[PDB]
Design a protein around this ligand. Structure first.
Ligand SMILES: N=C1NCCN1Cc1ccc(Cl)nc1
Ligand SMILES: N=C1NCCN1Cc1ccc(Cl)nc1
Ligand SMILES: N=C1NCCN1Cc1ccc(Cl)nc1
Ligand SMILES: N=C1NCCN1Cc1ccc(Cl)nc1
Ligand SMILES: N=C1NCCN1Cc1ccc(Cl)nc1
Ligand code: NA
Ligand code: NA
Lengths: 208, 208, 208, 208, 208
């Protein structure tokens, strides 16, 4: 006999959780990590500077309100994102809504760590010039919390321990040369607070 | 120990939320301020007089029924628009529904001030003539309450509007020459009362 | 101190509207007036006899179960259509589902009179022949109740007036010559009863 | 002073609605009739053997769990299909999901007879060869229950006979030569039971 | 009089299904079998290495929490998937969301065995090179659980012989030369556990 099973954990999470309440820990912002693992580049237009790509948006953060004693029960459960709070990230230069290609489930660990990694197809406005050259083009995608400023949400790249083209389609007409990520904190007109973002630089080119 | 946290504030807002009730203060109309920050100009057809544009629609208004004492609690919260009343604005010359590219969350201040600023991609019917000339074309976009007349909702350009081209994409095939906002008050045959609107004149041209 | 405010009125409507129940008074059918205000004519094709049109579909009818004494209270409110019964109108020759470009709110008057006027973009299969001539083309659009027969819903064209181009976009590649309506009552092979429709005739042509 | 009105009948149907429960009368299958009233033929590609069609899918069956004494009550009511059980019909050769152009309402008679007649636009994979000839093409469309076998649902062509092109648009680029039906009973490798379908053959040709 | 009817069964399922809870047996992984029956090949593009496929994704697994005594009651029922737990399968190389063409119902047998077989149209990124040769092309489709690792979900190519062109449309411009399945267990850089998938190799070519 155990202390709890998945049904108990999920039941408790659904019964509470509060999807609309940001899990700030006292006076600290929620530390969100986000990185883009590119899977494909389906269309590129050097005249209009538009690209159509697919990527896994690995997203992580902690939500202590989800934690549970796992000394005698499962250590993790897959949870519908509709049942928990998730960062309100947006790509500033996206020109289409994200088309989520995978089941919208996050993975919650008994300590409150949450991983959400949907595969997404989305179009963007970025620098496509040079794509047809050896040095390639460098398309920058900026992602960050849409409505939470720096005192509520911070964004940093996730860690990386693999090739930038690790999961990139070998059948794409393009190939990846380099993928880098840099964090930023920007203040805009509408509001007095600063908003953080991660800038992902996709350096790619048309294959020979 | 505080008086309340985000969970409590959001709970109170959700529980008393009358999304379908315009927050008129007595008999005064709800004063709505609107201004467009252009992000991109994607499709332009001078033959059909049609254009595709991406813009942030900064919308502000006061809803006193949302106010709370923040002396010992958070001063603001991000709230899903489905839990609040929002102006029923519509672009009169739009020929496509608004494609909202950002999380649909409004920011609510403890005094009742609300800010909703979605990034929208929408197609419009306007004058594209001259877009390929030095003077460029001037496309006018009209926005106002669809069902609330002047005595229930007033719409005015945002007083501070200096960032109209601040976020415009340097990668667009077009460039902005000027953005002007103006207010109107029209009476249409269908009905007796007058409906206010804001007219945004986008003077732009094709690079080259 | 008044008798009631919008919050009270909308609360009562939401609690008792009965959206699935046609508001027939005794045994008299619900008199639904339908009037199309043409806003734009977009992608016309004389080869396939298809056309894209944008119009305000002014729809009016009365629902006595919505009336309230507005002696000392608002005499009108905007209500989400999901909270009211609305006629099940359908465009017989439409070849695409209606794209509603406006907030789906109807205006309900204290005496029970209801007005719903969505701006719609929809494609139709009609006669485009002669669109390039001085006499132009005459595209007929048929609209009527899909499941309520003549004894339950009566559709009547509102003899609004002339000036059918009052709200027609000056930027369209086409122009409106004239708009006329007429009432039909058809018995289909599926069923014994008769279903009525208003047939709007749109005579238009490409601007010379 | 009647026995009941529409509000009472629709209240009882909604309250005891078992939308996910096939209403088999004891151990007898549910007898479903279906005939397709072709309204239009919009896209025809003889290269890829694909066609875009608009048709009224006249569907009828009996659900005795809906009946009510109509001595002094309405003889019938229109009911949102989401509140009733409907056959899980699927076109085996469709290559796009059905686009329902009409309000999703079914008509229920006091005896329990039900009629659901959506107007549908759908793309199909069929023989388009000889569409440009005088003999025309014969595109066969197969429709049957997707998850209910012959002992639970039987499917038969509607006995209702009428001009094939009876409601076919006169503005289509094509015209109908003839429409014949055929009832099949097939056994598929996945499952041990037999599944029924109605095969509708659309003999049409392009206009000269 | 029986022990139970479909109404009772579906009611118990609706009340106790727990759709967000994977039905792991005691502590073993849920054995999921997957088999793709190809129905059609459309929109092939050898330049971009993309193809549109229509297939029945035969999916089976066991959920003993659904079992019931059918000695005096129906042995099976069709259940809306929203009322059941279903494997969170995803096609790794799909570049469009799956378009489900059939009613989203699964078949649940009284012993607890579940079958879900939606017909799906979806675009893929794969090797289309050689489609115009006698050897044809070989497009591999990889499908596995997105958030459940090998210890929670195992995926296996159904063990059974079946003509690959059994249900393939005779009107497609392409034909199937052969179809083979391969099982895999993969560890992704994001996570420590291994995730299983089945890779289906579709060898097809353009018909002469
Ligand atoms: N995160 C961003 N990007 C541009 C402006 N902004 C901040 C912001 C703040 C509040 C609301 Cl409701 N919307 C946006
Ligand atoms: N804002 C506008 N534009 C055209 C007509 N109108 C006013 C209006 C009034 C009432 C209802 Cl239900 N809908 C629209
Ligand atoms: N309004 C029309 N047009 C064609 C047939 N019809 C009448 C009708 C009657 C009942 C149901 Cl459920 N659906 C449609
Ligand atoms: N319509 C038919 N005939 C044979 C198979 N099939 C499709 C089908 C049957 C049962 C389930 Cl759960 N899913 C899909
Ligand atoms: N099955 C796959 N493919 C890529 C990563 N992954 C595993 C995985 C783990 C956790 C969450 Cl929330 N999402 C996906
Ligand atoms: Na454990
Ligand atoms: Na300005």
């Amino acid at each position: 006999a155990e202390a709890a099973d998945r049904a108990d954990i999920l039941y408790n999470i659904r019964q509470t959780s509060r999807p609309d309440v940001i899990p700030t820990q006292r006076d600290r912002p929620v530390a969100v990590s986000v990185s883009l693992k590119f899977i494909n580049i389906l269309e590129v237009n050097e005249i209009t500077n538009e690209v159509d790509v697919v990527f896994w948006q690995q997203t992580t953060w902690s939500d202590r309100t989800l934690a549970w004693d796992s000394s005698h029960s499962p250590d993790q459960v897959s949870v519908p994102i509709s049942s928990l709070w998730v960062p309100d990230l947006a790509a500033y230069n996206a020109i289409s809504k994200p088309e989520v290609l995978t089941p919208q489930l996050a993975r919650v660990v008994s300590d409150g760590e949450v991983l959400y990694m949907p595969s997404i197809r989305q179009r963007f406005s970025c620098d496509v010039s040079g794509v047809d050259t050896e040095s390639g083009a460098t398309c920058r995608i900026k992602i960050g919390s849409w409505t939470h400023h720096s005192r509520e949400i911070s964004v940093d790249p996730t860690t990386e321990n693999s090739d930038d083209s690790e999961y990139f389609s070998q059948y794409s007409r393009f190939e990846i040369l380099d993928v880098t990520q840099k964090k930023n904190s920007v203040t805009y007109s509408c509001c007095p607070e600063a908003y953080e973002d991660v800038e992902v630089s996709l350096n790619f080119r048309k294959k020979g």
